Design a protein around this ligand. Structure first.
Ligand SMILES: CCCCCCCCO[C@@H]1O[C@H](CO)[C@@H](O)[C@H](O)[C@@H]1O
Ligand SMILES: CCCCCCCCO[C@@H]1O[C@H](CO)[C@@H](O)[C@H](O)[C@@H]1O
Ligand SMILES: CCCCCCCCO[C@@H]1O[C@H](CO)[C@@H](O)[C@H](O)[C@@H]1O
Ligand SMILES: CCCCCCCCO[C@@H]1O[C@H](CO)[C@@H](O)[C@H](O)[C@@H]1O
Ligand SMILES: CCCCCCCCO[C@@H]1O[C@H](CO)[C@@H](O)[C@H](O)[C@@H]1O
Ligand SMILES: CCCCCCCCO[C@@H]1O[C@H](CO)[C@@H](O)[C@H](O)[C@@H]1O
Ligand SMILES: CCCCCCCCO[C@@H]1O[C@H](CO)[C@@H](O)[C@H](O)[C@@H]1O
Ligand SMILES: CCCCCCCCO[C@@H]1O[C@H](CO)[C@@H](O)[C@H](O)[C@@H]1O
Ligand SMILES: CCCCCCCCO[C@@H]1O[C@H](CO)[C@@H](O)[C@H](O)[C@@H]1O
Ligand SMILES: CCCCCCCCO[C@@H]1O[C@H](CO)[C@@H](O)[C@H](O)[C@@H]1O
Ligand SMILES: CCCCCCCCO[C@@H]1O[C@H](CO)[C@@H](O)[C@H](O)[C@@H]1O
Ligand SMILES: CCCCCCCCO[C@@H]1O[C@H](CO)[C@@H](O)[C@H](O)[C@@H]1O
Ligand SMILES: CCCCCCCCO[C@@H]1O[C@H](CO)[C@@H](O)[C@H](O)[C@@H]1O
Ligand SMILES: CCCCCCCCO[C@@H]1O[C@H](CO)[C@@H](O)[C@H](O)[C@@H]1O
Ligand SMILES: N[C@@H](Cc1c[nH]c2ccccc12)C(=O)O
Ligand SMILES: N[C@@H](Cc1c[nH]c2ccccc12)C(=O)O
Ligand SMILES: N[C@@H](Cc1c[nH]c2ccccc12)C(=O)O
Ligand SMILES: N[C@@H](Cc1c[nH]c2ccccc12)C(=O)O
Ligand SMILES: N[C@@H](Cc1c[nH]c2ccccc12)C(=O)O
Ligand SMILES: N[C@@H](Cc1c[nH]c2ccccc12)C(=O)O
Ligand SMILES: N[C@@H](Cc1c[nH]c2ccccc12)C(=O)O
Ligand SMILES: N[C@@H](Cc1c[nH]c2ccccc12)C(=O)O
Ligand SMILES: CCCCCCCCCCCCCC
Ligand SMILES: CCCCCCCCCCCCCC
Ligand code: NA
Ligand code: NA
Ligand code: NA
Ligand code: NA
Lengths: 504, 504
């Protein structure tokens, strides 16, 4: 089996899996909407009670499977629970990252396309008032993605956008096809420092911004002043737990597969902790310091709230571009910003594609080249639904990317700490640990973490699924049909894997 | 390898593959529209110059592949032409019957649902004038299939319709899962005589029909009086060649796979000829005598033309039901009519599903039970697009079922008689023949048949594809996407097959 070459490379790859667009766009928007500085209360709590515990568990599951030649959950789940239903639940854990890859690489491609456009200065140039600066950037984005101009939910990406998607897939493939140590690890070692450098440069540049409407300080102010009254609200705790889940990429399958290239007794306790901490620093220190402070410096605390409510995507792809178009050196700054996002996405998309690659390798015994190419083929083909059908992305992100991962995380907790055995689980996590998990986490993992996740899944799912099932356009069924198809396809491959195994 | 048990069973199964709804609905409509009695000119010509020749070729290809353990075209094409592109063209020949199965079994289910409804008398009862009798039957059908009432191209089959689809799949599976001799062959031996009996009873009953508007004789009159002027028209020759292709099920893959269970030196010349002749008798004698004569007896030669133009589907599923609702014993007659159609479809759907079954068996070494069940799973799942998306059926029938098969037939001609070798082809067809193919067919096969097909593909494709590509609703892309996906899926399975082979 492939293995990480260095401790540092492992950790930077795992950190790269976690550090994505969310660090710089989602966290700051969720913190601003869910109590500002107060949000660090439920956020730090979620980190300690859900994020850390589940992260170690996923590392443990992957290292465990890896020792037996298995990096994906159909096989691993079955190893933890020798039952046909385990294999099936396991399929769900491979379907998630496949479906996510199918929209995420396209999202990633947009950051590359915008970096290129911003680098060469092929961007809009306004001219006044807020909407007069935003609209040209909204149009710029809408033209790139091909947002429907009419009543058909059909998208039409620009040719440039499509070609950039091809290039982005190519770049992912170039990395992946070199494998774990010479591809992913090697890339992480360049990518994480680059990312760090860009983010710091960005934070500095941002902190200098002054306009008649305000300064970067005003932005930090608005972002971080506590609103302790929002803690009363239950949706703030859901937001925090969800933000932790998303930021650490839990339940998505990448951690498990990456951890499957960690050696049998090689530490995961400290390595996992260190990768999580890197993500948290990039998230709260860097991400907390760029996008919102810029937007508030430029638009002023007067529009802070409306800006936060308009969301992470508008913030990263319309509002900041616009702000860059109005500040000194801003076009080049825009390139730096999108370059940052691109490496942030790229370090995660290689991670999210590796599980399908591992599966084909481990279970169907494809060569790495064939596994990477067929995985790229499936993702590339599939992504055409996402590129051309409006809201397809959203439906995949919901069922696989959201409901899916949280339910799957809960499943991970139960299979590992309850079915496999709480004491076996504990020993599996701690074996070879450079440091040991505090004994108190045994109870957190067995009782607290699953309870938490059970609430996130439940209290929340009641408040989401009915809307998605009832208030959506009929075309959602197209995406549902297709991804259910993908689930059936994976079930079939697992069936073939087990037939191939019985033969040999 | 499985083999047919009896000569008779082989022939009745192959005849059952050919004899379908077309015999009783399409042929009579095409003959009435393309010269009446005159139509037998280009029709008999097509039979001799395209239908017979290509049929023998497909039998020869399947028997040939069968001797080497291969019943489907990815493997067989490669055996005839050891080139990667051969395998790929071969994939197309397995994709066709998979896609066709995916809509055809649903069409079949409708005949079963209507037979049941008509048997128990749960049908509409009009009351006057033509539309006043038809409309309740149009509505009856529209309610069953769930034709869109609004502007969304969404279908909503009745629950009854859906359940009947489940039953129909079950019935197909029950037959298929018993395999070639104990399932398909055994069923053919009951089904073909039953079919013959129903058709004869129907012809007799129909010939007795008298109304103030006319008699069955008037119907035969209108149907068979020649219009030799239409032969001038090129589209009449296309219609005839196409009708022959469709009636004999050529290019669809079922003949090749069925023939793969014929023993290495067991005759195919006379057996193939005999199965074709059975289809022709059922088509021109029986099919020519029922549907149109009934419709004209009842509605009168005054509306003969308009009725023919309204098409085979309206004829079989609306107009005849209605006519049955106005004649003595007509409800029970309606049951007999739909029972006839059901067995006609059922004997063909088992044939069209066998290629995917053979592939999984021959190439992935699945057991017959697993191959049948997974094939049923894929067809069942896939059919939901056909059941719920308006015009999906039509798009599949076009690309796979129409363009597909004719192009594939041409491909068969070229690979066999040109690439494999015209003399090797000839010997392959004739080996073990009870009778020998007339020497003159050597030239027909090498020059005439491919020319014919090249024209059907070309002259016609110019006149069809632009309309389908330009004048269709955007939702066609959903079906295109999906069936291209199916093509990619099959390519992947072939890839796995060849990897499994290299390993063993
Ligand atoms: C290989 C998968 C086939 C599915 C059909 C998708 C073909 C993509 O088509 C492409 O779309 C681009 C972006 O809209 C256009 O700019 C280009 O003209 C190109 O035709
Ligand atoms: C490395 C230098 C090459 C970069 C050139 C590729 C970008 C060209 O992109 C162009 O941008 C224009 C302005 O937004 C658009 O109007 C055009 O549709 C086009 O996509
Ligand atoms: C390095 C990647 C950047 C190169 C991608 C450039 C492709 C965009 O080229 C585009 O072609 C379209 C069709 O002719 C034009 O309408 C656009 O204006 C644009 O020039
Ligand atoms: C993006 C890379 C080049 C940008 C370099 C310009 C950084 C200086 O930035 C400037 O700082 C001034 C105070 O010193 C402020 O009044 C202005 O907001 C201005 O942006
Ligand atoms: C969901 C799978 C993607 C399907 C949509 C991508 C291809 C759409 O392409 C479409 O083709 C039509 C017919 O040639 C053209 O008339 C349209 O302009 C459009 O380019
Ligand atoms: C079982 C899944 C629990 C998820 C809890 C946190 C999810 C909150 O994220 C939510 O996702 C929704 C659907 O994707 C979006 O429409 C909302 O805007 C929101 O961001
Ligand atoms: C490709 C075939 C699509 C058929 C879709 C038929 C079902 C239409 O139902 C649709 O379902 C949505 C999602 O639950 C709901 O928001 C609405 O009820 C909508 O009408
Ligand atoms: C197993 C494949 C899942 C795809 C969703 C299709 C579920 C079919 O749903 C069924 O449709 C019938 C016919 O319209 C309805 O009468 C029934 O209520 C039933 O819900
Ligand atoms: C073997 C006896 C059982 C046959 C009963 C099943 C048929 C019931 O079918 C019924 O037909 C009605 C009249 O068309 C419809 O209005 C109902 O929706 C229903 O589908
Ligand atoms: C042997 C196969 C025939 C049995 C199928 C009968 C299923 C149709 O049953 C249907 O249920 C619907 C939902 O409650 C009703 O609206 C219809 O009127 C009908 O009764
Ligand atoms: C469908 C099975 C039962 C049908 C039996 C009735 C057959 C007799 O049919 C009758 O023949 C008469 C002349 O003899 C005609 O005038 C009428 O059209 C009538 O249909
Ligand atoms: C192309 C794959 C088939 C998808 C369509 C079959 C399922 C459509 O079912 C739909 O579900 C909606 C949400 O629950 C309901 O509101 C609608 O009434 C409808 O039944
Ligand atoms: C390469 C394929 C050649 C086909 C020649 C005969 C086909 C004539 O059949 C045609 O099929 C069309 C599309 O399915 C239908 O829309 C027309 O009504 C017509 O029946
Ligand atoms: C599921 C995603 C569907 C995206 C479809 C986008 C292409 C829309 O183009 C469509 O193509 C049809 C067939 O060629 C043509 O009849 C029309 O040009 C139609 O507009
Ligand atoms: N961790 C990423 C988000 C993420 C979760 N799961 C993923 C899977 C693939 C790519 C990204 C992700 C971020 O904070 O931005
Ligand atoms: N219109 C912005 C949000 C917004 C509202 N008011 C503002 C004032 C300033 C800047 C942005 C805003 C968007 O949807 O993306
Ligand atoms: N659906 C979320 C993003 C997301 C994906 N997976 C998640 C898991 C947990 C929380 C959020 C997410 C959004 O659109 O904002
Ligand atoms: N568990 C110890 C020692 C160890 C065991 N196997 C390893 C493989 C690689 C590196 C270290 C180790 C550690 O991680 O440090
Ligand atoms: N031979 C059938 C039509 C047909 C052609 N190919 C098929 C494939 C499956 C089922 C039926 C068919 C008929 O005349 O009615
Ligand atoms: N309206 C019938 C065809 C038709 C036209 N005129 C007629 C007169 C009598 C019977 C049928 C017809 C259909 O579309 O199905
Ligand atoms: N598409 C034809 C039926 C058909 C399917 N395959 C064919 C091959 C040849 C001729 C006709 C067909 C129709 O709707 O009428
Ligand atoms: N070719 C001869 C004899 C023959 C060879 N192999 C066979 C297998 C089965 C039946 C007959 C045969 C025939 O078909 O009659
Ligand atoms: C697995 C990734 C899901 C995407 C969630 C959003 C992340 C924050 C940046 C906004 C851009 C995303 C486009 C919908
Ligand atoms: C392979 C079968 C294709 C269907 C062609 C039509 C056959 C004649 C009867 C009409 C009913 C079919 C519903 C579209
Ligand atoms: Na993160
Ligand atoms: Na990343
Ligand atoms: Na036929
Ligand atoms: Na048949």
């Amino acid at each position: 089996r492939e293995h990480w070459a260095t401790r540092l490379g492992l950790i930077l790859a795992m950190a790269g899996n976690a550090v994505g667009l969310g660090n710089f766009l989602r966290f700051p928007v969720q913190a601003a909407e869910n109590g500002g500085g107060a949000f660090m209360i439920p956020y730090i709590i979620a980190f300690l009670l859900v994020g850390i515990p589940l992260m170690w568990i996923e590392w443990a599951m992957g290292r465990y499977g890896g020792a037996q030649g298995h990096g994906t959950t159909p096989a691993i789940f079955y190893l933890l629970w020798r039952n046909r239903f385990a294999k099936i639940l396991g399929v769900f854990g491979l379907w998630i990252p496949l479906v996510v890859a199918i929209y995420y690489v396209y999202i990633e491609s947009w950051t590359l396309g915008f970096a290129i456009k911003f680098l060469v200065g092929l961007v809009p140039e306004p001219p006044t008032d807020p909407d007069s600066i935003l609209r040209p950037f909204k149009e710029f984005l809408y033209s790139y993605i091909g947002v429907p101009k009419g009543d058909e939910p059909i998208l039409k990406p620009s040719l440039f956008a499509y070609i950039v998607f091809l290039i982005t897939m190519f770049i992912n493939v170039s990395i992946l096809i070199r494998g774990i140590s010479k591809g992913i690890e090697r890339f992480a070692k360049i990518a994480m420092p680059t990312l760090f450098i860009l983010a710091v440069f960005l934070v500095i540049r941002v902190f200098l911004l002054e306009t008649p409407n305000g300064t970067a300080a005003d932005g930090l102010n608005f972002l971080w002043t506590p609103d302790f009254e929002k803690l009363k609200d239950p949706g703030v705790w859901i937001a925090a737990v969800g933000q932790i889940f998303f930021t650490l990429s839990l339940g998505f399958g990448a951690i498990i597969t990456y951890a499957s290239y960690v050696r049998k007794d090689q530490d995961i306790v400290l390595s996992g902790l260190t990768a999580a901490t890197l993500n948290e620093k990039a998230e709260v220190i860097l991400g907390g310091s760029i996008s919102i402070p810029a937007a508030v410096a430029f638009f002023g605390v007067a529009n802070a709230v409306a800006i936060a409510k308009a969301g992470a995507f508008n913030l990263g792809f319309i509002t900041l571009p616009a702000i860059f178009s109005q500040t000194a050196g801003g076009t080049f700054l825009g390139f730096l910003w999108f370059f940052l996002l691109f490496f942030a996405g790229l370090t995660s998309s290689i991670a999210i594609m590796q599980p399908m690659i591992a599966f084909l390798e481990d279970e169907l015994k494809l060569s790495r080249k064939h596994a990477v190419l067929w995985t790229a083929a499936i993702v590339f083909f599939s992504a055409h639904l996402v590129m051309f059908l409006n809201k397809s992305l959203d439906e995949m992100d919901f069922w696989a990317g959201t409901i899916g991962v949280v339910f799957f995380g809960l499943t991970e907790l139960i299979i590992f700490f309850w079915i496999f055995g709480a004491d076996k689980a504990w020993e599996e996590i701690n074996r070879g640990g450079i440091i040991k998990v505090p004994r108190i986490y045994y109870y957190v993992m067995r009782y607290i973490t699953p309870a938490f996740l059970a609430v996130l899944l439940v209290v929340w799912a009641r408040e989401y699924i009915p809307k998605i099932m009832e208030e959506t356009h009929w075309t959602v069924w197209i995406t549902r049909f297709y991804i259910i198809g993908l689930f059936l396809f994976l079930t079939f491959l697992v069936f073939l894997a087990e037939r191939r195994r019985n033969h040999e």
